[PDB]
RNA sequence: UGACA
């Protein structure tokens, strides 16, 4: 009861995460907190086991969002991820994870780990990688 | 000088 946060779980996508979070908080409230939970935090891309620092949860696009390829092949997250790495999205109706370095614009550290992630593949971490050297 | 977006 009234449980929150998660000490860097082994395996679980932030979709499954933000999912349980969907079963608690209100609507407006929901989105506000959830993000705070993943924001500044990082996720593990199941398809390419690569972790990026989620600084913003894209509560607009779904794992279906598309984009053209080299020659212009329009493939969706679901596709690019399923065909190239086969990570079966499945929850093709949740948001996205806009991972951004969002450096402190201070001196010249420049933060790393930017990426448009699928919440259904992001193994919640706890990295919160700050590494920049400002 | 934004490293499988």
Q: Total number of β-strand segments?
A: 7
Radius of gyration: 15 Å
The count of helical stretches stands at 3
The major sheet is characterized as: 5 strands, antiparallel
Shape: globular
Subcellular location: Cytoplasm
Protein name: Piwi-like protein 1
Family: Belongs to the argonaute family. Piwi subfamily.
PDB class: rna binding protein/rna
Q: What this model shows, in words?
A:
- The chain has 134 residues and is of the alpha+beta class.
- It has one domain: paz domain, CATH 2.170.260.
- It has three helices and seven strands, in the order ααββββαβββ.
- It has helices at residues 14-20, 28-38, 77-84; strands at residues 41-45, 50-58, 66-67, 75-76, 96-99, 115-117, 122-124.
- The protein has a five-stranded antiparallel β-sheet, covered by helices on one side. A two-stranded antiparallel sheet has the order 3-4.
- A hairpin with a 7-residue loop joins strand 3 (66-67) and strand 4 (75-76).
- It starts with 13 loop residues before the first helix and ends in a 10-residue tail after the last strand.
- The PDB classes it as rna binding protein/rna.
- The entry lists the keywords piwi, PAZ, piRNA, ssRNA, RNA binding protein-RNA complex.
- It forms a dimeric assembly.
- The entry is titled "Solution Structures of human PIWI-like 1 PAZ domain with ssRNA (5'-pUGACA)".
- The protein: Piwi-like protein 1.
- Organism: Homo sapiens.
């Amino acid at each position: 009861c009234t449980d929150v946060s998660h000490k860097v779980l082994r395996s679980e996508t932030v979709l499954d995460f933000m999912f349980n979070f969907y079963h608690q908080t209100e609507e407006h409230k929901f989105q506000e907190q959830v993000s705070k939970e993943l924001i500044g935090l990082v996720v593990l891309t199941k398809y390419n086991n690569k972790t990026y620092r989620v600084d913003d949860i894209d509560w607009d696009q779904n794992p279906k969002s598309t984009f053209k390829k080299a020659d212009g092949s329009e493939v969706s997250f679901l596709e690019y991820y399923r065909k190239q790495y086969n990570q079966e999205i499945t929850d093709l109706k949740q948001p996205v994870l806009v991972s951004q370095p969002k450096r402190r614009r201070g001196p010249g550290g420049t933060l790393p780990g930017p990426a448009m992630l699928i919440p259904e593949l992001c193994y919640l971490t706890g990295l919160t990688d700050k590494m920049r050297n400002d």
